[PDB]
């Protein structure tokens, strides 16, 4: 078989589907997944084409973080022609994929100085290093915003050509473009990848059918590693992916207005963040919470909804307070256990993975699609994706000391972002008493691996049985690679 | 007989007519969407003593409404038996709790919460109702923020709750079993000539003939009848008391054994948790009088409801899964009292304007209207709440002006705000003049209750002017 | 026969008055300066606190129940004691008594684990004692005008539990002491002189030597440091630390004041909120408490803000616009083992009256009469024997009880602020506080556990101060076992 | 007589006393006032040598405000030689008048955007227009400060050569310098100025004595107009001066440290503000509240102490929380009813006034002293100070509309500076309901005069009898000058 099966109907599966179908007109490409898109990250996304907006001091302090950032900057260059190529298969009445061209990053004091001040400086430095067009602007010159004065920004940064897409219109344009290129949509889920003699044979679907293929591309979001891990040896050779459960909302604004740009903060405690993405027709998207969950979750918590709404109404626009809630959206960011994506080939011939993209898979989609298609055609794809090969020992991108400093800072940031009001001795007391328990957990989990802060907090507050199972997992991975 | 409306009141009267007049054809109108429907957004509490306020019981009309709530409570056990009888085990149980605990905390105005707790205690003793003031430590399940915790608690025996969804299903099933016909269209127009109902034009363009039309269309009820000659200024207006509630799957699948509630709070909102089967709880409920209907929750309503429940009832709700935000319109009568009974048009009846407690009163109200339709006198104390009336003036302008300022201040204390200590007295002083000026400008004789007065204060000048005209036309009609 | 009383607070002056009145055979000299450096008494309201001072934690220990019984006994002495002190003065000297009754308020600006438990404990103690009291409607509490979000929802009227003006009390004690033939010598003791196991007298800070057959040490928080210089007494007299307390005198906006004491139960680390009536359009508001390992004679910013914020929200918003006349600071003598030091020593003629913490002023007439009885060869008051100053440290609670208490009191500092936090934070803080306090308690000593008020001070002290206390506890164990 | 009596022993009386004594060695100069300095502004001052730091958008929007600012810049140039001349009369052990050379202005969000953002921009503009040395600096580069992250600054401005003096050391140096120049200190208060045939005869003192003089200089702070108003016709010809009651504190810092510069915000609601002025010997000065009172007050309110302490501990240094309170200080800023100082001569020969300087008489003192001494010697003194002659119709420096906008903004700023936490609809509700009552008060007080916002709020919350007496005062002033 020269047949291709793409497992997954999010932005990544559809993007790779479109690129395969367009580049290999001679081959059958079939894409699996259902219109419900259960736990789907893409439909819950605003979405920001986040490159410079996603910069943190912590990410850029590591070689792996600098490599991930370079790929985000490369992906941004592909978006204008990618959108042109997808809108080309449609008409005016399909709507516009692009909802804003530019982003304003706001700096307010509703957060930790150790995150927000460090991250604002890191964004400014990254923009200058990349020769990207940008301007620090007067807050008074920021269009539309009407914050609570006690929650207001005092600095603002205009990022030119860093925009947003309507994630729903993007998915519709990708499906339309996939069909135009001769792709076939089969609305079932893969249950099992079939392989023997180190080669893919095809996919068993959840209706009990078997589909043969020479190539299987796994882009099933947070389910991607669980699907591949069933193959021989791969349980401790493919890094685990967890559910980065994210809550967002669609709001009909009081007057039908919206901002001309994305409005956002830098990434905040445990990779949450505040942003507003413009939409057509008097709607705005507000996001977005983040919680790594050891099992998937398909509903928003009360706490997530209150935090998102409170941040947006105070820090962006008080008019949102009186605005109508249209939809609370929940999706799972694929959260890799070592903090880096799983992109490329396996020890199994014709088996490819595109997953573990967490906050910025949608942004990276055109670059990731082209990378995997290049590899499938015997090329080397995009330089600097090599470290993010899916079959690997867990990456250790930071020292245990760096992660322990980070997890305590992020824990304290949950207070400052609330924002809390406490006696002034309490924060220093909590900082001192948080250090020991996180140090003890990190030392107990493994002699070699340290989970990033976002996962470490989830493990700290999980059941003893869940902690013990992860100790076993890390020990089995060490055994496999050392 | 045509019943217009498929909420608790329309279906309850439909069931009572169908069961009592097997010789007559009874058709009930309304759609499964139940647009703006109050009943499906209700918990619901069978609220009698829990609904007591000092302000309500200070007026004759308020004391009359309370007496009817106490009477209605006695009908519920046999009413539920009669509705469950038409179903099987798999249909679920209408009753979700037998008892209520009222909590007193300091996340509110002393001028409402302290006065209302005393009024509830007095009303229970006056009625010889079974109840006990209990230690807060003895209230099962609750886990409040210590800064938001109750310091007093009141156990009300035999004041419980129903699943409003299971009630609606049981009413529809019981209606069909009694030979009622469900026609899933809306009435557009009531047809009448020579002072008699002819029937109803539906929104599919059809005409249904009838000798009797019962209007139970919730917040749409007066707008529907007001098109008939002279009735525009003879049937009190009904507005949308937009209410937000939520269904939450609890973190551990647990729930309280009783209703948990505060007394009624600023502008007839209030905090309660109603138990549900299957690891779900109902939390409610906000209230905002809107001059035009609204079918979606505001961000502000969702945050206030969630913040109150997580702090004052159970911090575990914070980590619990949001299943559904519900929005419905409490039918809010302009004079603060229900519209129940006959009209100057033969065969035209109304059951509406029940605001917070139509669902609780439903079996009593249904039996009252059915008695009237059969030539009886129904229930003694409902006469004052006849739908064709001059607007009731249940309070002095002075009482309402004191109340609207107190309720305005209570929106601060219920938040709860943190302000410099001179600000509250400053705001109290500067609120008095503008509300006095509005009340004096609206009418020489009528004063809207606080819940509506705040909505009018913050409405457009054109909406205020239209109400000035309405009140003047009502005065002209009745005086 | 010469007697020297070292200290010019309520306890020194009360014992001075009782000796001078009772012992025509003795010349009695009282030392101490009008500045009353670190003086607890002048910073006190003061409440005649017996039932108001009840906590669940105090009454859960035998030692705590014994201390409470003595407070109830002391209350009965006050009417005749005041009569006897005012008798030596005229109308123009003012009235010692400022209120007859107390209202205890319960609000939610605090930890349920302290305030709810303590309100129940006060109610139980009143009923057990058959003391006159009534739970009253909050609406019936005169004068108060709280923030609605800080308001009480329960109130308790305690009949015959009142207050005195601490300044007028001190003036009446000095005047009564002089009338009875006592001599006031306004210098400080630097050294107690003893040889052949007997007191010889006192070296004063002007370099003089005063001979005496009897020396009574009532020098507040300085009492143990003064006696500890004598042979072996460093590990035989329990340490007394400074329970630094801040209070204020406020001239009310309209010159009004409440007719009763207004108070909460005792709150985090033995602080609490109260208003004590004063004459002439003044009110006393108090009072903060922080155990300090070294003395401190000035209020911190944090103490002033906390006291003022509590009083303006929980008692009367009118205090916000009222004039601040005086911020007062004094040291409650805080015994390391949580119980007073009252009676005789292994040194003939050496006596101690100290370590009374929150309620030495209330207990003063009873404590004074006890020590004077002992000095005259009597047995004084039954059940004050257990509080003899020369003792092994008392262990009135298990390590487990104290560790539960210190975490609860730590959390209460948050709820009393009151803080506003994400709802998961309190449980997180409770979990992460347990280990560090357990580790400290285990490191300090195998046998002794400091009470919560001192344990928090030690937790946040320098490593050198912690190490010195480890050595102290080890030297005490060595001396007594 | 050619004798001079200076009435008042604050910075202005002593500064003019020193200048008279030094310039007229042939004349007897006697200075009245007691060491208690009842209601004294000077001893309660930090004090900042505030020129650019005192800039507000509102002040610089009026001609009179721009004139006052020019005089502050001129006064700054005199301080170095003035201090040299005062320290010259002392020895090393008397200590140093100057406590800092430079100022950092901080911008945080614990206040109204309508004051703090507008005022920060106005300070920056005034510095650039004056070609004054200054730099916008990174907040991370501000030494010493340790704010609550939720109360932290996000912008900071370093003003070179704008410093501070120890007000206590200044007063001691002025008294010593006055004696060195042949001045006599008489520690009694003036009760009555004696004048007949349009000429001063001298002063009756509160010990019942009479002191003859050819010249009487009234520099009695907030008591200055009440003292002169007893003379014929002067009740409606000398603008009233009220008590701008100000609370400040001396704190011994936890570690004996202090900042190297003044730390301040711009002027905030009703001319209060937050600042820390360095002192020698492990002490810092924190200030300062401001409340116009229609009668003098010599004690801090609970509210004033809490607000000052809460602002300093959160916005400047959390270490102040655990620091020892040494002294709460209270003084009366002389608050002129028309918002401008009273400096120069009267219709009574030999009668002079130096008062109504509100926030910046201490800073202006060397310039004001030299101006009045020039006038007494038949000169014209300093060009722009003629407009602030004490015998005048009330100045109307702003429209009624401007003042009504200002009073509502300042009222709302008392909320944001607290900072309050309120439902988001409440601020707009309060703004709407404040407008009518202030408009009604302004219209009722006078057809021609409008009190500035600081006084208008005091009048709004005064007794009906106090409002009626001011209506009569304004009517009598109109009658006198029209
Ligand atoms: C948030 C919330 C909480 C509540 N909680 C309680 C509680 O705890 N206890 C309690 O007793 N009650 C509660 N209630 C309800 C209260 O008692 C109401 O007064 C009562 O539900 C009114 O019922 P109704 O049948 O008159 O109106 P609805 O329940 O609104 O029913 C009217 C129906 O008529 C339909 N309709 C409208 N126009 C037409 C037309 N032209 N033709 C046909 N159909 C039409 C509507 O779509 C709707 O389904 C609550 C309500 C809300 C919103
Ligand atoms: C803020 C506050 C509030 C209080 N409120 C109350 C209350 O409501 N009710 C209550 O009953 N009690 C209250 N107290 C006081 C409490 O009861 C104390 O335990 C009691 O005052 C202790 O009295 P004392 O005489 O032992 O000590 P102090 O009152 O401290 O007297 C000791 C005196 O001895 C002097 N001295 C020290 N060293 C020497 C020396 N070497 N030579 C000579 N003299 C020396 C000191 O300068 C001082 O004047 C309060 C205390 C504080 C600080």
Numbering used by the authors:
A (entry chain C), D (entry chain B): 10 to 491
B (entry chain D): 13 to 491
C (entry chain A): 11 to 491
What does the primary publication say about this deposited structure?
Here, we report a noncanonical FAD-dependent enzyme Orf1 that adds a glycine-derived N-formimidoyl group to glycinothricin to form the antibiotic BD-12. X-ray crystallography was used to investigate this complex enzymatic process, which showed Orf1 has two substrate-binding sites that sit 13.5 Å apart unlike canonical FAD-dependent oxidoreductases. One site could accommodate glycine and the other glycinothricin or glycylthricin. The resultant product is no longer sensitive to aminoglycoside-modifying enzymes, a strategy that antibiotic-producing species employ to counter drug resistance in competing species.
An appreciable volume of a cavity (539 Å3) close to the FAD/glycine binding site was initially considered the glycylthricin binding site, as it appears accessible through a narrow entrance for the glycyl side chain of glycylthricin to reach the oxidized glycine. The true binding site, however, is located at the tetrameric inter-junction entwined by the C-terminal four-bundle domains on the opposite side of the one misdeemed. This site will not be known until the determination of the glycylthricin-glycine-Orf1 ternary complex structure, where it is composed of two neighboring domains with a tangible volume of 1415 Å3. Glycylthricin resides nicely inside the cavity lined by interacting residues (F279, R306, S310, E313, E312, T423, E434, W435, M438, T466 and F470). Specifically, the carbamoylated D-gulosamine and streptolidine lactam moieties are held by residues E434, T423, T466 and E312 through H-bonding networks. However, the glycine amine of glycylthricin is distant from the α-C atom of glycine in the glycine binding site as far as 13.5 Å. Geographically, the antiparallel-β-sheet (β11- β15) of the glycine binding domain serves as a physical barrier, separating glycylthricin from glycine. Such an arrangement negates multiple reactions in one site but instead supports two separate but adjacent reaction centers. Overlaying two complexes (the C281-adduct and the glycylthricin-containing structures) reveals that the glycylthricin ligand is positioned by residues E312 and E313 in place, making the terminal amine group of glycylthricin in close proximity to the α-carbon of the oximinoacetate adduct by 3.1 Å with a Burgi-Dunitz angle of 99.7° an approach trajectory. The nucleophilicity of the terminal amine may be enhanced after deprotonation by the main chain carbonyl group of N299 (2.7 Å).
